Amino acid sequence: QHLTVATLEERPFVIVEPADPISGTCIRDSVPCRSQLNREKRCCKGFCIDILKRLAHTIGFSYDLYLVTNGKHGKKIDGVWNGMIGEVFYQRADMAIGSLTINEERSEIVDFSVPFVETGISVMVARGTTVSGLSDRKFQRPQEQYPPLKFGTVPNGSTEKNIRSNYPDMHSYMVRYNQPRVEEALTQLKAGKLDAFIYDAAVLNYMARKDEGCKLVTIGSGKVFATTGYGIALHKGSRWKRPIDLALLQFLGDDEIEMLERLWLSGICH
Ligand SMILES: N[C@@H](CC(=O)O)C(=O)O
């Protein structure tokens, strides 16, 4: 009846802010979240946090929410998982929720809920920049061009895993252009230091919709990469999967998720 929940900041799905200075509490639509390093203070809000609030209410559990510091979403290195996936896999958390992408590798070792956000991989470029998309040889045969195209991703997640598995030559080229967070990637794109940023589609599309001046645009990967979704990670064989799935499927049909997309993921640019 009390669940430990791991999450990770990735705006606008999970947004972290200090407690209200005046009250010392998390006000508005925010909820208390602590750091993995530790153990109000910090407070979390956003699309995934609203999902979590509704699940807790509908299913009837209480929870302790914490932010992962041991890596990010989840990466397996030399036999060991880090990030949100590792927290669930090693049973430090009963579930993990955030912008967490379902893939085959992860699905082998944790159970996921049904997907509640559609995503995949997209490419973001400055509106001026002329490429056709991820099929462009500027991407696919990157060192065939005299001044080479500069393109990168934020490493360690499902995006990099997909590129390394399916397009190993392109992946090897991208390594020098790894970015530490989406915020720095966007900054490099705008400074011309990158020509393109390849990343999670749900996040990139949102960033395009919110770009001041609407100067950043995304191209869908088309057939280059498959579509997938965000899912809540749970212990393999978790008793929580079924009630969570039922709730999520209910939210979908009630237009509750659609409402939350409007609330959190809308922007001015189109
Ligand atoms: N949401 C993705 C982030 C990425 O593509 O790097 C993940 O769970 O790994």
From Swiss-Prot:
Residues 130-270 are extracellular. It comes from the Eukaryota. Glycans are attached at residues 38, 156. It is found in: Cell membrane; Postsynaptic cell membrane. Expressed in brain, mainly in the subcortical region. Disulfide bonds join 26-43, 33-44, 214-269. L-glutamate binds at residues 99, 101, 106, 158-159, 200. Belongs to the glutamate-gated ion channel (TC 1.A.10.1) family. NR2D/GRIN2D subfamily. Component of N-methyl-D-aspartate (NMDA) receptors (NMDARs) that function as heterotetrameric, ligand-gated cation channels with high calcium permeability and voltage-dependent block by Mg(2+). Participates in synaptic plasticity for learning and memory formation. Channel activation requires binding of the neurotransmitter L-glutamate to the GluN2 subunit, glycine or D-serine binding to the GluN1 subunit, plus membrane depolarization to eliminate channel inhibition by Mg(2+). NMDARs mediate simultaneously the potasium efflux and the influx of calcium and sodium. Heterotetramer. Forms heterotetrameric channels composed of two GluN1/zeta subunits (GRIN1), and two identical GluN2/epsilon subunits (GRIN2A, GRIN2B, GRIN2C or GRIN2D) or GluN3 subunits (GRIN3A or GRIN3B) (in vitro). In vivo, the subunit composition may depend on the expression levels of the different subunits. Interacts with PDZ domains of PATJ and DLG4. A hydrophobic region that gives rise to the prediction of a transmembrane span does not cross the membrane, but is part of a discontinuously helical region that dips into the membrane and is probably part of the pore and of the selectivity filter. This is Glutamate receptor ionotropic, NMDA 2D. It comes from Rattus norvegicus (Rat). The gene is Grin2d.
